[PDB]
């Protein structure tokens with residue numbers, strides 16, 4: 001008798017791309033062989049948007065751990081990309097293209113995930129709560145859920161080393177040696193970990209930690225969800241490499257039980 005156990009997969013062949021997603025070979029600044037690039041290819045729309053949909057549905061009956069290497073654009077919070085949305089949903093890549101994800105005020109309904117927010121959108125009440133308005137590289141991370149009507153809301157919390165919870169961090173810098181600590185314009189690991197026993201999804205990035213319960217995210221233990229890596233950018237605000245959000249899927253790892 002045969003039962004599907006955990007798998008660990010790596011590489012872009014396990015994802016289908018949607019919208020503004022393309023390949024960049026041997027990017028000189030990132031020092032790896034290939035990245036998947038968001039917000040470069042045109043899609044005939046002012047709002048560039050793109051998604052990588054994992055071809056396997058993710059079973060929440062079992063643990064998973066995603067280690068996703070991402071690099072952020074070296075660009076102002078008012079010029080660059082909206083950010084990264086790591087998204088779980090019954091919807092698919094085509095629905096995301098039409099309704100959005102978790103990086104703005106509204107998105108695909110009944111979905112949830114973790115966002116690295118790198119852009120200031122005056123229409124998003126979350127960007128105002130986080131004092132995102134600025135001209136540098138200050139962004140924030142948080143788990144996010146959309147309701148039945150599509151509205152995004154914060155879920156869970158930062159787990160600070162000391163003091164008060166804080167979502168903010170610098171998503172890029174003008175460091176002056178980029179070897180050692182966190183420099184968000186380089187490839188850095190985002191760990192997305194889920195423990196089916198505790199019901200907790202944990203995100204680790206930029207030396208910070210966030211947690212949310214799947215009950216508060218609106219995900220059910222017994223369901224299986226599509227997993228999407230997304231980014232978007234509003235054009236016309238900037239310019240070479242403008243808005244580029246890149247991930248190295250060849251050295252990213254995804255451990256899960258497919259379903």
Ligand SMILES: [Ca+2]
Nearest residue numbers: 091095108109
């Ligand atoms: Ca939907």
Ligand SMILES: [Ca+2]
Nearest residue numbers: 117119121127
């Ligand atoms: Ca934002």
Ligand code: NA
Nearest residue numbers: 030031186187
């Ligand atoms: Na790098």
Ligand SMILES: [Zn+2]
Nearest residue numbers: 009010011013
């Ligand atoms: Zn493979």
Ligand SMILES: [Zn+2]
Nearest residue numbers: 073074075076
């Ligand atoms: Zn720059």
Ligand SMILES: [Zn+2]
Nearest residue numbers: 147149150151
């Ligand atoms: Zn709602």
